[PDB]
Amino acid sequence: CPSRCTCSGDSLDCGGRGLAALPGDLPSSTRSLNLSYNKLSEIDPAGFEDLPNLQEVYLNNNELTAVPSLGAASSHVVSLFLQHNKIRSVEGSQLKAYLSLEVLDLSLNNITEVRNTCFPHGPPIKELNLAGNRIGTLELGAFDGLSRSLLTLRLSKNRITQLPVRAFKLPRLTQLDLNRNRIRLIEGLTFQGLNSLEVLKLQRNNISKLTDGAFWGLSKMHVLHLEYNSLVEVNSGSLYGLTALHQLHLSNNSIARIHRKGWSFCQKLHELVLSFNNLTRLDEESLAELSSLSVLRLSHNSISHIAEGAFKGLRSLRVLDLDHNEISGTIEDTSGAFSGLDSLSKLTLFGNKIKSVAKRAFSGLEGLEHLNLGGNAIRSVQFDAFVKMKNLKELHISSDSFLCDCQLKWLPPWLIGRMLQAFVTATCAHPESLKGQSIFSVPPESFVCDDFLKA
Ligand SMILES: *[C@@H]1O[C@H](CO)[C@@H](O[C@H]2O[C@H](CO)[C@@H](O)[C@H](O)[C@H]2NC(C)=O)[C@H](O)[C@H]1NC(C)=O
Ligand SMILES: *[C@@H]1O[C@H](CO)[C@@H](O)[C@H](O)[C@H]1NC(C)=O
Ligand SMILES: *[C@@H]1O[C@H](CO)[C@@H](O)[C@H](O)[C@H]1NC(C)=O
Ligand SMILES: *[C@@H]1O[C@H](CO)[C@@H](O)[C@H](O)[C@H]1NC(C)=O
Ligand SMILES: *[C@@H]1O[C@H](CO)[C@@H](O)[C@H](O)[C@H]1NC(C)=O
Ligand SMILES: [Cl-]
């Protein structure tokens, strides 16, 4: 066993020793070899006999300028970790010898380009990680040599600008990671050739336009990440072919309206996240085709108008997030905004502009167990406003704007009797003989209006 290195079983730890050369002097039984955090500028391939057990090799955080040759031991290496070196190019002639290579980490290097010759037919790579380089050019078919084996491909934090039609022929890839690049636009059929794809990450690009058929071919995809882009809308045609889609993440875009037609193409959707956008209204049946949808997140928009039947068709919905919008009149005057939401369990309207609560506002919310009306300056609640919600077990209220007249008299004893007083902070604004006092502190007969007609 090496002088400065440490031997525990079949693992050999030479990491953080500060070596420029390789010790070796390498035990035949060595399976794991940690050479990371040294100052290696190169590797001498003659140092790697005899090592029939060599499977894992850690060469990250060194000064390597190319992918190295492990000599006689190359063809048995299963995982090769090369991240945080100074490698500028990947040489297919050097990867040819790695006939057992399954994991290859090339992240955080100085790679600017990938050509076809970089990844030839040879090494059966399952996971290729190229994240955090400066890749700004991909030849058409760059990874196609790895098609029979490649399952995961990470291209995060590069400088990729566009993708051609039918960019990849990688029919077994299950995850493609293209986030934090510079893609502005996805053309039609860009991702055809990715039959097995399950997860596509396209967030933190500059995507302004999804072409019709942008994602056609991705019929097995379950998750699509499009957060932090520049979409002002989601065109119906752009969703065509996403039949197996379960999660759509559109947060932190600029989406100002949603079209109904597009939801027909992903009916098996389960979670839709449209939070942090610029929506102002929700129109009738605009979501009707999403009948398997379970979770809908619409918080941090500017929604002020919710049409009657806006949520019709959503028979599967369980969680509705409408926090931090501009909602007011919906809960004050409108009836039927929530019809079709019989199955709904949780609904939150925290931090809106609601001043009063009407009985008719909650038409269609009978299954509700959780209601959040906190962060609203509510002045009054109509008598038995929550009568249809027999299953309501949690009710959040936080207002110091209450008018404590005869119209509010019913609320404290009803809340206490339903075990709903725990999450209610309710303070009286008027009358002035009751200001600042808790809704529960006020004596029952102190709640009075003007009865000018002596009855
Ligand atoms: C959308 O973007 C906003 C920022 O523009 C994200 O907000 C936050 O960032 C951290 C994550 O929770 C918090 O510590 C910050 O306080 C919070 N900032 C603001 C201004 O709210 C938000 O999480 C993003 N959401 C999604 C789904 O992408
Ligand atoms: C590898 O060596 C580095 C450098 O000291 C150390 O931080 C790390 O924990 C080691 N890991 C393994 C698996 O040996
Ligand atoms: C990164 O790669 C480029 C390619 O020419 C090179 O000029 C630059 O010096 C590299 N950076 C470092 C820190 O070596
Ligand atoms: C994204 O594209 C738009 C289109 O004009 C423009 O702001 C610029 O090219 C890009 N902006 C950023 C911040 O990358
Ligand atoms: C989107 O809404 C945010 C606040 O909700 C606002 O600051 C921003 O200017 C809006 N953008 C557009 C393009 O309307
Ligand atoms: Cl991210």
From Swiss-Prot:
Please give the record's induction comment.
By EGF.
Q: Which domain of life is it from?
A: Eukaryota
Q: Where in the cell is it found?
A: Cell membrane
Q: Which residues are glycosylated?
A: N34, N110, N206, N252, N278
Q: Where is the LRRNT domain?
A: 1-28
LRR repeats located where? 29-50, 53-74, 76-97, 100-121, 124-145, 149-170, 172-193, 196-217, 220-241, 244-265, 268-289, 292-313, 316-338, 343-364, 367-388
Give the function comment from the record.
Acts as a feedback negative regulator of signaling by receptor tyrosine kinases, through a mechanism that involves enhancement of receptor ubiquitination and accelerated intracellular degradation.
- The name on file for this protein is Leucine-rich repeats and immunoglobulin-like domains protein 1
Q: Which organism is it from?
A: Homo sapiens (Human)
